[PDB]
Amino acid sequence: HSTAETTLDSFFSRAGLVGEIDLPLKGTTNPNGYANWDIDITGYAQMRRKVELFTYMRFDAEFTFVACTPTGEVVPQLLQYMFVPPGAPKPDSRESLAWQTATNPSVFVKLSDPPAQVSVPFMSPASAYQWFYDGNMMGTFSVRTVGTSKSKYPLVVRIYMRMKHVRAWIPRPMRNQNYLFKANPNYAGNSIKPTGTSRTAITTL
């Protein structure tokens, strides 16, 4: 719409796969039928370099839950998908009393349904999230299969996130070197690369 695609609404505008948890029928990955997943936005591999063009941001989030068999099959199972706000305790087992605390909101849904979809607001104590602190908790999704016994099907749950109502302040230079850690600007000082490609002489095309 005559430069409405370079706005920050359009630059952060699609649902990307962040987070993928697996509930196997046998093994040691998740031996019981539950899993915890802390909300980070940098599980999508192209996302950390984009948000670190700025210093402060402020947005809302929208989550979508699609689930299936490792082959891709759709089976009649019921799941729970509850949200633990920041500052609240998290479940330890399947018989924890945190699964039925009314201040942790849940979404009961069958596996033969459209994917579940919820919205999470801005929840920081400050006025913005900051990606650089010289001197950012959103919550946790717990995923369980409903029952007193173990389920009969292996399941995989994938989580998608779209950001909305985006504002940003104070642009910064973009990332030049490969990352090594999380929330940490360290780099490999014994191998520093140029920003782009090279040529043989300054007078040769």
Binding site: A128, D134, I170, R172, P173, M174, P185, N186, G189
Partner: protein
């Protein structure tokens, strides 16, 4: 005069603090200072920084150097959000943070070319995601002085060029 981000300091130790002189040679990398960490030890500002709980202040920074007409070189002075003798850059190409120096002109900046001028002035407002923070646990920004084009002269001239930083606090609060 550069006013950072188009905004003046405003309400929500009014004197000049000439820090010290750096010496710029033919093999210098660059220097950085962290604010308000540079000033929590000297004078009346250093008392009110560590005796109060909340803090809010803007600044005005002057960077000067003096040389003859037989010297050449260029410096880039910039301010990037997030002692009193500074630190030296080890890897000035990646700014010791993994970000390139060739894009540092997206910040409030000013050039010092010895052929043309000898003084730079940047005004910095108060920037935080909070209205008040602690002066001793949180540094707001850093000041960068990096030689892009190196110093040069013929043998017999003065081999070392002075660089003096002088600053003035502007619209400070303490609570």
């Amino acid at each position: 005069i550069i006013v950072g981000y188009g905004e003046w300091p405003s309400y929500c130790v009014n004197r000049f603090y000439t820090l010290d002189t750096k010496l710029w040679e033919k093999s210098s990398k660059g220097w950085y200072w962290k604010f308000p960490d540079v000033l929590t030890e000297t004078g009346v500002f250093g008392q009110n920084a560590q005796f109060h709980y909340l803090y809010r202040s803007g600044f005005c920074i002057h960077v000067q150097c003096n040389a003859s007409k037989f010297h050449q070189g260029a410096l880039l002075v910039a301010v990037l959000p997030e002692g009193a003798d500074g630190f030296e850059l080890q890897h000035p190409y990646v700014l010791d943070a993994g970000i390139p120096i060739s894009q540092l002109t997206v910040c409030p900046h000013q050039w010092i070319n010895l052929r043309t001028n000898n003084c730079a002035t940047i005004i910095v407002p108060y920037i935080n995601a909070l209205p008040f923070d602690s002066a001793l646990n949180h540094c707001n920004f850093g000041l960068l002085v990096v030689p892009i084009s190196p110093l040069d002269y013929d043998q017999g001239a003065t081999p070392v060029i002075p660089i003096t930083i002088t600053l003035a606090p502007m619209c400070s609060e303490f609570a």
